[PDB]
Amino acid sequence: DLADRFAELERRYDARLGVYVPATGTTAAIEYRADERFAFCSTFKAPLVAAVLHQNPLTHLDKLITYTSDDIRSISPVAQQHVQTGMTIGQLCDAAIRYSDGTAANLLLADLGGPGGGTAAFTGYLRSLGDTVSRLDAEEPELNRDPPGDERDTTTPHAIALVLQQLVLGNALPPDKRALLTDWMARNTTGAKRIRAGFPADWKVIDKTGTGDYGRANDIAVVWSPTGVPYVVAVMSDRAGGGYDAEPREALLAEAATCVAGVLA
């Protein structure tokens, strides 16, 4: 009855909703528009922080990177406080994962592929995990503003969730490197009103969000049952009919998250 409840979501909130939950040994896959393209928005900072953990040793996190007030061309709640200080590669990973810091993203992107190769560099990291489908093409902010139907800067709920089962549950990262990424999104401060609000409080919820033009509200999560059994949820939505300034409904992502909880009980 999942598609039945999910179309009603789309109707009530006038939105396009995409959900995919990978099948476990006991639990079938849930999927709604799983293989349609949605815009990454800030969700890409989660597997990008994974690229930077993979590519270098844990020593790299202490390399101080100097950035400016010029380099802030995007919402940057935590990077904006170090206009001259510069921050450790581990602290940027903190910003862009947990505060969705936009400027951290571009430095992290710059550290991964240089000035001009960053987006192609992160996209190749996604390829390196089997995602032959997602692409990044722009840096912040423009990656959040592509027209609907455009393939650039898009992932799919299926693709991004399969990326997430490897990062947190798989062996994409070694145990310690993986330790920090998971810890970062567990500390994440943005997704309170999304997938977290859909599951019971005795579930363990570790998420990273994305929000952008055309009503775009995304949340990608790994959740844990009272019996610890792990589940990867990726919820993506846009409201591309109301134009570029359409309001994201966060309550949508919460709502959809109470249905997959209604079947992962």
Ligand SMILES: CO/N=C(\C(=O)N[C@@H]1C(=O)N2C(C(=O)O)=C(CSc3nc(=O)c(=O)[nH]n3C)CS[C@H]12)c1csc(N)n1
């Ligand atoms: C310039 O780029 N345009 C952006 C943009 O920066 N998007 C990023 C993205 O995905 N971000 C995320 C996040 O990770 O969700 C966030 C975190 S979401 C959030 N959490 C809160 O607690 C809160 O009080 N407010 N908000 C908004 C901010 S925008 C940035 C944007 C936001 S709305 C819109 N039409 N464009």
